[PDB]
Each structure stands twice: as C-alpha cells, then as structure tokens.
Amino acid sequence: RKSRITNYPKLEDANKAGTKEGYKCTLVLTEGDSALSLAVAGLAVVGRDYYGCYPLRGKMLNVREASADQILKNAEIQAIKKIMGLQHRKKYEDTKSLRYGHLMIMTDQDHDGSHIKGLIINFLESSFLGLLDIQGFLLEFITPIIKVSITKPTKNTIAFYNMPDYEKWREEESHKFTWKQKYYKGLGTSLAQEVREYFSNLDRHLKIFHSLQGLFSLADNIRSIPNVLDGFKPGQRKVLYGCFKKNLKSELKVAQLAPYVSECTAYHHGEQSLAQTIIGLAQNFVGSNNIYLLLPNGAFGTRATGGKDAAAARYIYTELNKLTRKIFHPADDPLYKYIQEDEKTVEPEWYLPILPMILVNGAEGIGTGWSTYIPPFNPLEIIKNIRHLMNDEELEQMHPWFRGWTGTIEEIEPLRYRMYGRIEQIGDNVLEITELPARTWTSTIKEYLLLGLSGNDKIKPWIKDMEEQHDDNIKFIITLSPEEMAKTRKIGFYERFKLISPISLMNMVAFDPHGKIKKYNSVNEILSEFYYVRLEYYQKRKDHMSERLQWEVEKYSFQVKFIKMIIEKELTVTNKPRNAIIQELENLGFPRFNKEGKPYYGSPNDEIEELYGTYEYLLGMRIWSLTKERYQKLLKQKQEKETELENLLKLSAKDIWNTDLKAFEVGYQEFLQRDAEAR
Amino acid sequence: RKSRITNYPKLEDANKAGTKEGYKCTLVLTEGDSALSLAVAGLAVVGRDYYGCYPLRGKMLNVREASADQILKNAEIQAIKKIMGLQHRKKYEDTKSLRYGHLMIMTDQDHDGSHIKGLIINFLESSFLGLLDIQGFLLEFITPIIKVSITKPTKNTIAFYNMPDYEKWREEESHKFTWKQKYYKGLGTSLAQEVREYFSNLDRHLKIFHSLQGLFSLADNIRSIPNVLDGFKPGQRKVLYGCFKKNLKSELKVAQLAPYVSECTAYHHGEQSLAQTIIGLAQNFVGSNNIYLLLPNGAFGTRATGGKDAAAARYIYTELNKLTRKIFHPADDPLYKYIQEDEKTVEPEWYLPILPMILVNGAEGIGTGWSTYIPPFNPLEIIKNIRHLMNDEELEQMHPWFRGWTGTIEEIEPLRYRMYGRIEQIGDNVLEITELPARTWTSTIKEYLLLGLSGNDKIKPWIKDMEEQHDDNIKFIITLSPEEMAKTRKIGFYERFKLISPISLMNMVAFDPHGKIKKYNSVNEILSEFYYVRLEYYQKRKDHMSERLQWEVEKYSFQVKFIKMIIEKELTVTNKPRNAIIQELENLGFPRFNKEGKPYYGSPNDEIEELYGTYEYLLGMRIWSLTKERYQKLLKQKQEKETELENLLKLSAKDIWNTDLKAFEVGYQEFLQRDAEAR
C-alpha cells in the first residue's frame, strides 16, 4: 500500500515510504549541491529501501538578510509535510501514520550556515513539536570525534561521536583489546568516507530501534467489560497482580514493569498495550482515577488533554500507591482462584477489594454486543453504605463524584444527571470560567474558544478577546461586546460555553460473580451484589486464618504430649531404630507435619514427602526442650496460641471487615492530602 | 614560583600558569578576531586565575592552498610549546611539569575551517602524542545540542552536548521534575551566551577533575628495602594482603583496587603511589616479574620502555594471578603477625611463601644509608634446592634468570656476571639483532641506533641504514658500509651494539626475619635463611591444623559421653532447672565450647560469652541424637575425626611443604604456557 507523492519531481522516495513500514523510513533532506552528493554517497551504502532524499539547494553569496524572501521557505515546508505524511498524524500520537519515521538533515560545504536546520527545527517546534520529542525522529549528519582500531581479539573499528561514549568505552572495554586511537582531523577534501560511516552507523542503529516494537464475541467482551467486584478488565488485573507479585515498594520504569507483568501473566497483546494500561492505572489528573492504585512518577498525561500527552514508557516510573494494599488486603490473596494457563497460573478470576472499586473509579468500555459506562463515586459514601448493609439499615443514595473536581452535579430523572462547571461575570462583560464539567478536557474548550474568537468560517466570530491564566486550576477570562454578552444571556452562559455535560446511568454493565454479563439497575444494585460476596469472603479469610492457628495449636499440643510422655517415662526413644520409633509414634496417634505446618494423621505407606510430613517437629526438637524451663515455656506457648485462636474466633466477619475499612479511612485521608497538596 | 613567558607579547597568561598549579590551567588558543572576543567573553565568567589566552589571527579569502607558507605555522607551534611548557615534560609522564594542563581551541565565524585544529592535533600527534591521550588535555568549544529548564523541585537549567547525555538524563531523571526541553537552533548573532555557558561548564568540571588527586633513616629504609622471606616492601605487601582480603577472583580497575587497598591498610602515601605499585606487581613483559602475582589486564607497560607506558589506573584492571595462592598458601594466613595501627590491624609483618619470592623476582631499592639489588632466578632451580636442604644434600649454584628472555649469562668472578643479547650476521654487511640483554629497553637501543644512523653531531654517523621489524620479539636489521662492518669487528659486535650489561650480586640487602638490615653474601645464604623459617612455619601450620582437629575430636568425644550417660541412665536432664543442669555438667567435667570450637574447662563465675562457650553443643543437639542410628553415626564421626587427626600427625613438616611445592610446579607449568602463549 504505497501512498505516492506526485507533485514533487525532485524527490527520490524510499521504496517503503508511505507504506505499512513508512515509520521505519528516513527522509534525508539535503542543503546545497555538495550535501546532495554526500547524501547520495551515504545512500549507496544503506540502500534506497528505507531512505528517501529530497534536496533544497541554493546558497548564494554572504550570510546576510534584510530585504526578505519567503515564498520559498513556505513551499519547502509544504514539501516536507506532504513527503513525510504530516497533517496525517493526530498530535500526541506516534509514528505509524506517516510516510517517513525520521528526518535527517545534511548541511554542508560552508559554515554550518544551515538556513535550513534553524528553519526545520523552528517550524517543527511551532507546528507539530510533538514529533520533535520522539526518540530519534530528527537526525543530523555529524562526523566522528575519534576512531578506534582493534588488532587481536577480533578485527574491527569503532567510531565515537562524543567524549562520553569514547570515555565509557575506554574505561569499560579498552583493556580487553590491543588498539590505538586516531583523533579526528585527518582528512583531505572528502567527507565521503565519513558520510558512509554515519549512514552505516545510523542504519545499524535503526535496525535495532525498530526491531524493538516494545464467533470474537466472548474474547472481546471479556477484554472489554469490567468484572464488578474489583472493577477491572483482565488487562488491568494482570498489572495489579503483577505488581503484587514482585514487591512493588520502590519505583521502576513502566517500560521495565510491562515486560515483567506480561511474562508472569502470559499477556497476549502488545507490550505497548500493557504500558498504556499501566499508565491508565496511574493517572491522577482531575477527571481520571478517583483512587489511582499506581502512582504517576512522571508525565503521565495531563488534564488539558485527558492523558494522551503522557510521556513514553521508558522515561516514566510507577510504584504501588501506598493505599493500594489497604484496598486489596494481602490476607485475601490465598482465597483467590488463580487462573491456569499452560503450566503457570496467572492473575485471579477477580480480586475482592474491601470496597467496590468499580464504584470508586467507575469504568467504560465497548465490546461486541455489549457496552458499558459507570461514572465514579465518593469512596466515603460507599463506606457509609457498606456500613448500612452491615447494620441492616436503609442504603443512602449515591451520586457520581470526582476527586479534586469542584463543579456541581444535579439529578433530573433518576439514572440521569447534568454536570456543571463554573462561570462567573467578573466585570461588565468579562466572564471568568473557573471549572469545566468533569471529563471535559481543558483543550477541547480552548479550541472552541479560539474558533469563537478568530471566528474561522462556519459562522461569524463572537468573542472580543480571550485570555488563559490557568494555574493548577482552570481560568479562562472571556471579554465580550455589550451586544454579544446580552446574546449569551438568551442562550444561557453555561450552555454557550459548553459548561454542561450529562451523566447517564442507563448502561451500567459488568460481568457478575460467575462470568455472566449483567446490566445493573442501580448504584445500590451494584453495591449489594458486591457486599454479599465480600462478606462471604471475609468469612473465608477468617476460616483460613483460624485454620493455620488451629494447626499451630495442634502442633504445640502434640509436642507437649511427647515431651510429657518422655519426661514422665511413658515413651522412650533412647535407642530402638528409626522405623520402630516412628511407627510407635503413629500408633500413639501423633500426627506428622509438613513444611507448611499442615498435620497428617494417616498411614504413610505404599509410595512413601511434603504430602505427609515427618516427626521432625518432635525428634528434631532440642534436648533442651525436655528440661524444666523449656517445657514450661512450651506450655505457655500452647496456651497463648490457644488464646490467640479463641480471640480470633470471637470476631465476626463484619468485625474484621470494619477493622479494614477503618484502616483505609485513615490512609484515604492521607491520600487525599498528598494528592491535593501536589496541585 | 612563576616561570614567566617573556617573548610572547600577545599572551594573556593565567595568574597561576607556570606555577605549582600550572597543570590546572587551560591555555585558550583562539582563531581569528571573532574567536578572541568570544574567548574573552567566556573568560570574564571564569576568571583569569586558571585561564590563559593567546590568539593566532588571520583568515583571508577562500579555502585554497597551493603556493605554500609555513614560516608562520612553525613559529605558532613554538609559541604553544613555550607557553604550555612542553619540551619540559619527559614523554610518558604526566601533567605537573607544564605551565598549562590543558589546551582549548576556539575556532569560529566561517566554516569550521580550522586551519588550526587540524595543525594543532597533527603536531600534537607527531611530537608529544602522549599528552594527546591524557583525559581532557585537549578541549574544544562546542555549543549545546539541547537545553533543559526545570520548574519545581528547585530551579535550574541543564545544557546537554550530545544525545547520549540528554537521553540518559531523560530516562533516569526527567520524571523527577516538571520541565520542558529547548532544541538548539534558537540564536541570532551572538554566541556570547553559549561561550559563557561552555566556560562555566568547563570550569565546573575541572574544579572536580583536579580535586581528585587520586633522623627519616628508619622510615625510608623500611619503605625502600624489601624483607627477605617474601621479598616485599610494605607497599607491595599491603596490596597483596588487600587482594587476599576482598576475594580477588574477578577483575576490577586498578583505580578501584587502590582506594580499597589503602582503606584496609591505612596507607600513608599517594593513592597514585599505590596504583603504581599495583601496576608493578602486575607487569609481565620480558624483564619485569618472573612471576607476576597480579595479572595485567590492559596496557600495563611494555618492554620497549620498561613499563613507563602503562595506561592510566582507571582504564586497566588486575586480579590475583591464579598461581598467587599456590605460592602464598591460605593455610598460613592464621600464622602471621598482623601489624596493629590505630584500632585496625593491617598486613603482616611479612608473608612466607612456599619459596623465596625475593629470589624468584629479585628486588631493587635505594634508601638512606642502604641500597639493594637482587636479580631474579629460576623458580624451578629454587625448588630443586629447597629439596636439597630438605634431604640434606649440597646446594647447587644458582644463576640469574629471566622469564621469557633468551640471551645468555656468564659468570666471570663469583658474584658477577655479564649478560648478552644476540646479534648474527645475516648477510655480507647486514646484522640482525634478535635479543637485547635483559632490562635493556627496546627504545634505549633504537634511540642509540638512530643517533648512529643520522649521526647527529657528537661525532660522525656510522650506519648505512637501519630497519625495525619487531614482531613479539626483537629484530633490528642493521646494514653497514664494508668499511664500518670491519671497524665493528675491531671493537666487537656485542660491545658496539651495546649488547652487554653486567649483573652484580655485590649488594644483596634486605631486612632479615627480625627487622635487622642484613647484607647477604650469596643466593644460597638468602635461600637458607628462608628455608629455616619456612620449615618452622610449616610446623606451626601443622600444629594449628592438628589443634583444630584435636578440638573437634574433643567435642565429639564429650557429645558421645553425654548421650551415653543419658541413654544408659547415669545422667538425667528431664527436668531440674537450667543452672542445676549446667553446673552438674561442669562437675562431670564436660567442657564448654565457644563458637570457634575452642573448649573451656574452668569455672565460669564472676563477670559471666565467647570467651568461655556454653553447653549448647550438648543440650542444643536434637532429641534424634539419642536414638540408635544417630548415636552409632555419632561414634562413627568421632572415630573418623580421630583417624583424620592421626593421619595428619603422621606427616612431617617437609611432607606438607613438598605437597605444596608439587602443586605449585603444576600451576607454574600452566603459568609459563599461558604467559608465552600470549607472546
């Protein structure tokens, strides 16, 4: 699929330019005649498959400029655009929609005098500077600072382009070879060799940068609709589970996190997809996550664009939000059903936080046959309500709520709200917009305020002038003609400034506890479903804990019987073989105990492990444990452990749940403080 | 102490140029008028204390050259020499003897067109290119590729000069700040800001590079004369001891090794001094160490110069020579007397290798009142002789010997030899020199062959022509006039080519075993002194080993008594308090045992540790050890350990020594193979 350039006769297009691989192509722009020859020479070495070349010739005499001349510059810019496939990528995106993925400039013969480089960079900077940020989008031919030749271990040469590289090599590798350096300023009038070297080098590098790309009904809906309970979709669950797996207590790049997460969770989608998910989980601008479980340590996206301006995976870092473990309590980990794939086991079918994360953060998604949208709600409300269900009291009603947001929400019909921003009249014909309805991005407004200012076609402009003094808030100051101000009162200030947006609860759908796609009919319907299962699982947690305690109590009990039976001579071990002494133990009823501390009481015959245990807990004890103080202590422990077991059993599932909710409430106060403080 | 420049009117000398700190000064060389103004501007920011400036103006029209003109270049070079203080440092040295420690070039206004840079580098390369290798001796003004501004954590800017630096920062730090980049090509006609930035940056860097400098009778002789026994001087002993301390089984830079060695051995001399010592210990060219204990992994110096051409400490690496531990046997470490300083303990008073290292490698040194020189000898001879002393047979005589060398040695009077290289007449009037007397450096010959070729004053030239085809050997091919060839037969081929050097044993001095400065009167006098002490220490080693075995035998013995006394009911522990049960143990005679395994038999009263021990070896045993199989095993171990002890006691000190010599002989065969193989 070759998009082809027809209007530019002087272009020598790459064979793959404008195709699926166009992003992998470099368009070599040359300045003046000599630059071109050199380009061509470098070109011969690398092939015309991934390299295009277009010349912008000229020069003339002097370095001067006073009488102007831009008919040229304008058109030169046009060429680069058409040729590279610009005006074809949406700002903030990546390189895929372009004819060329790079732009190399060749400036030469005279002083750097790149009337180009300046212009190129300049225009790049005021037109689609988002490109200008991409790794090595912009390239420039430069000659090596030092060349190195190696005689022995093998036979090859190394070209360095700056001291740091040379120096790091000299300190870390030089010693492993016999070599001599060759400071650069040993050339006549032929950069041909050096341009060939540059290209050879560049191609060798890009061949590596670009090698690093890091019926349908069920599959889609699964990956597209969240599971109520934890509010995740498989992709997010894998990240969370992954973070819990390696202990995420200190940051690491999201680009290092993604491969780890994919590895341990056999993710079948782009590593780029995961990194995106990690970023989503960490976003914290007003209108994203009410509680971000992942901490955005870097440019993770900003309110102005809704997070598409997030930086690249290799420059940003995340970590577990300190609060995340107070929501997804570690004590429930052993209760989950970890899905099996090949011979691994991955993330749970679902997690069960102490509060319905699906209502805390909300969710949105479109899959085949099914669609969803649940706005976010105030955690503090969710809790007051979980407590109502707990004390069997009527549930209070919950209305969408956004962290850090300050507009106002109003319910019209149940299941439907209208969300308002804020616009005051600060002076006779000067309006100050101090809030936008949540999820309405700061730019989408500016864009529209700009179209009503410099009224670009469609229909007549209508703003005298607009100013933007955004601090960490939103403050657009609008000034209108006495005639337009009064026209806005007729249509309505909020409606005209697009300061209203609706919130529909008409489509709250998510997989219920047994994989079935359900459409809930109320916040409260969702909260209850969750409450019942969560309550059950708190029982499951209690049981799991009491059982370990039970086994401990059992082990100490038998250690006491044993020592007693020995101390007051009813059991003698002094001599007699192994088998005899272990069988005789089985007969007296003493259980074996494996390494997890699980007791076993049956016949260990046939093929006999860790499946049964041993009497190591008895015979492996020290001689010291037959003495008085030790034995007394042994009894003291048995009793303290029995007491520990009782005490636990005296707590209701709800007692525990609430012990957890409280802990969260504390941490959530801290979380909100820290979150606002950084704003 | 300011050496002052008088003949160069246009020089603006640094206030500290030509002083003790001259090495810390940068002489900014400028090209053309505009370069100078810019230099001056950069100069204003950094001060004239450490920066000098000299202009080489000119330009003219074109880029052409055909009719020549070098009266200029010649003199321009002269200026740089005088000004920098060149012709004043001996090749291979360092920067200390110069007026200026750096040379920065400022090239500007036109195309790089540095008629200078080329010339500068060129002349640097064919005159004292040793300088050209020093870290940042040569500097060049360059403009930043990207500037970065930081708003928040603090407030500062960062200038990057190459992608790698920017990129490493972007990936490792960017995320910790709010910042925006600023691609460079945003300037009018004023590099003034950029030149100020460069200087500011450069000064900031050099202020760090140069901050990193890493009666007398007793002190001197101690640090100057080796101790026979190990053949070291305190400095070398500290390095060896240091290497033994951290386990040197994989390489690390000698610049990382030195600080470690100094730290753990409280070295009171320059870290630069140590690095030198480490290098000396690792050298392996023909004529250095017969056995290098430290492995030279990098340019550690070459035969051609006698090792002064060694690279810098930060680029080379060492490690323990695999054989080193077969010479300095680990089992003797506990027998040494480790000197105490402050509250540490350092290296031994001396080490005691299995063979007199002082004869293997030899030594040389000059201190106050005393002087020394002991050539190297063949390890294989030293051993045959140690064995003679062992079987009480007459010692054979030993003559100096060099590893990898191939000349010939002849004794004239006892205590004096003449060492010959090798020179054959390969054709009628063509001589081929294939060996130089050991310790006669490949360059000192070439230098003298060059003075006899292009007979530079003194007296008439005498070689028709000379060729140098050195592979990993030495091959100077000399061609002489029929008249000169016959004149060389009169003076003697070897004498005329300087192919003879004497080796005097007239001054073999080193500290003897009790610190006294002794002058030995024979190789054999030295070998014997050593033999007697080494033999004693092998006894000491035997004792030390037998004692640990004894204690093991003692411990097992008492464990057996205990279990027996319990199993056949003569001792009961089942109940009774601690104190009672431990005192009753003391009465039965059972010793306590500390953590090193040393038994104690006395009353542990008063202030009672690790000074006495406990009965943990008894009571801490498992209940399992009272059963039959365990007890049987316990007896089996006691017996095997008793047998182990006996067997050891059946070996004479000599038996052990020889078991060690043999191990060495194997490793030394491997060492020689590996050493030649790499040549």
List the single residue in A162, A627, A631 with the smallest CB-CB distance to B581.
A627
Resolution in A: 2.7
Q: How many CB atoms lie within 10 A of CB B514?
A: 7
B159 in A contact zone (CB under 8 Å): no
Nearest CA in chain A to B185: A118
Tokens of A190: 């032929």
What distance in Å separates the CA atoms of residue A98 and residue A364, rounded to the nearest whole number? 30
Q: How many CB atoms lie within 10 A of CB B284?
A: 23
B605 in A contact zone (CB under 8 Å): no
CB-CB contact of B16 with B101 (8 Å): no
Q: Domain coordinates of chain A in residue numbers?
A: 1-143+187-214, 144-186, 215-404+507-541+652-679, 405-506, 542-651
Q: For residue B315, indicate whether it is catalytic.
A: yes
Query: Was A332 annotated as part of a binding site?
Result: no
At residue A649, what is the residue type?
L
CB-CB contact of A623 with B621 (8 Å): yes
Contacts with A317 from chain B: Cβ below 8 Å = 175
CB-CB contact of A159 with B282 (8 Å): no
Q: Domain B1-143+187-214 has what CATH class?
A: alpha beta
Whether domain B542-651 has CATH 1.10.600.10: the reply is no
Check A623 against B618: CB less than 8 A apart.
yes
B residues 181-220 near A, CB within 8 Å? 181, 183, 185-186
SS3 A147: strand
B242-268: burial string, b at 16+ Cβ within 10 Å, e else: bbbeeebeebebbbebbebbbebbebe
Which residues contact residue A234 at a Cβ distance below 8 angstroms, ignoring those fewer than 6 apart?
A: A222, A223, A347
Residue A84: name the closest of A14, A10, A9, A1 by CA.
A14
List the single residue in A298, A574, A577 with the smallest CB-CB distance to B626.
A574
B residues 72-111 near A, CB within 8 Å? 109-111
Nearest CA in chain B to A113: B111
Residue B74 CA neighbour count, 13 Å, CB half: 4
At A679, which helix (H) or strand (E)? none
CB-CB contact of B277 with B235 (8 Å): yes
At residue B228, what is the residue type?
V
What does the angle CA B95 – CA B97 – CA B99 come to, to the nearest 5 degrees?
90
Place of tokens 């080329």: B118
Within A57-112, strands assigned E span 102-107
CB-CB contact of A113 with A107 (8 Å): yes
B64 in A contact zone (CB under 8 Å): no
Q: Which residues pair with B252 in a beta bridge?
A: B318
How many residues belong to chain B? 679
Tokens of A52: 């295009």
Tokens of B219: 């002190």
Print the SS3 string covering A317-344.
EECCCCCHHHHCCHHHHHHCCECCCCCC
Q: Is the dihedral of CA A119, A125, A127, A131 positive or negative?
A: positive
CB-CB contact of A254 with A242 (8 Å): no
Residue B94: name the closest of B223, B304, B282, B270 by CA.
B270
Residue A351: name the closest of A342, A339, A361, A340 by CA.
A339
CB-CB contact of B146 with B181 (8 Å): yes
What distance in Å separates the CA atoms of residue B588 and residue B580, rounded to the nearest whole number? 12
How many residues belong to chain A? 679
SS3 B233: coil
Burial class of residue A332 (count of CB atoms within 10 Å of its CB; 0-12, 13-18, 19+): buried
Which fold is adopted by the domain A144-186?
Answer: Dna Ligase; domain 1 (3.30.1490)
Chain A interface mutation, best of B122, B183, B191, B285, highest count of A Cβ atoms under 10 Å: B183
Structure-determination technique: X-ray
Chain A interface mutation, best of B627, B630, B631, B635, highest count of A Cβ atoms under 10 Å: B627
At B151, which helix (H) or strand (E)? strand B146-151
CB-CB contact of A386 with A531 (8 Å): yes
Which residues contact residue B10 at a Cβ distance below 8 angstroms, ignoring those fewer than 6 apart?
A: B54, B55
List the single residue in A136, A577, A627 with the smallest CB-CB distance to B629.
A577
At residue B279, what is the residue type?
I
φ, ψ for residue A644 (rounded to 5)? -55, -45
- For residue A619, give how far its alpha carbon lies from the nearest alpha carbon of chain B (Å): 5
Residue B465: name the closest of B477, B447, B482, B483 by CA.
B477
CB-CB contact of A596 with A677 (8 Å): no
Which residues contact residue A378 at a Cβ distance below 8 angstroms, ignoring those fewer than 6 apart?
A: A290, A398, A401
What distance in Å separates the CA atoms of residue B424 and residue B586, rounded to the nearest whole number? 85
Chain B interface mutation, best of A185, A560, A575, A576, highest count of B Cβ atoms under 10 Å: A185
What distance in Å separates the CA atoms of residue A20 and residue A14, rounded to the nearest whole number? 13
CATH of domain B405-506: 3.30.1360.40
Classify domain B215-404+507-541+652-679 at the CATH superfamily level. Answer: Topoisomerase II, domain 5 (3.90.199.10)
B residues 116-135 near A, CB within 8 Å? 117-118, 121-122, 124-125, 132-133
At B106, which helix (H) or strand (E)? strand B102-107
Under DSSP, the state recorded for B614 is B
Nearest CA in chain B to A256: B171
What distance in Å separates the CA atoms of residue A229 and residue A537, rounded to the nearest whole number? 12
Supply the angle between the helices A379-390 and A653-677 in degrees, to the nearest 10: 170
What distance in Å separates the CA atoms of residue A655 and residue B557, rounded to the nearest whole number? 59
Same fold, B1-143+187-214 and B215-404+507-541+652-679: no
Q: Distance of alpha carbon A624 from its chain centroid, rounded? A: 55
- For residue A135, give how far its alpha carbon lies from the nearest alpha carbon of chain B (Å): 9
Residue B542: name the closest of B399, B649, B658 by CA.
B649
Residue B172 CA neighbour count, 13 Å, CB half: 6
B318 in A contact zone (CB under 8 Å): no
CB-CB contact of B354 with B664 (8 Å): yes
Q: First and final CA of chain B: distance in angstroms?
A: 48
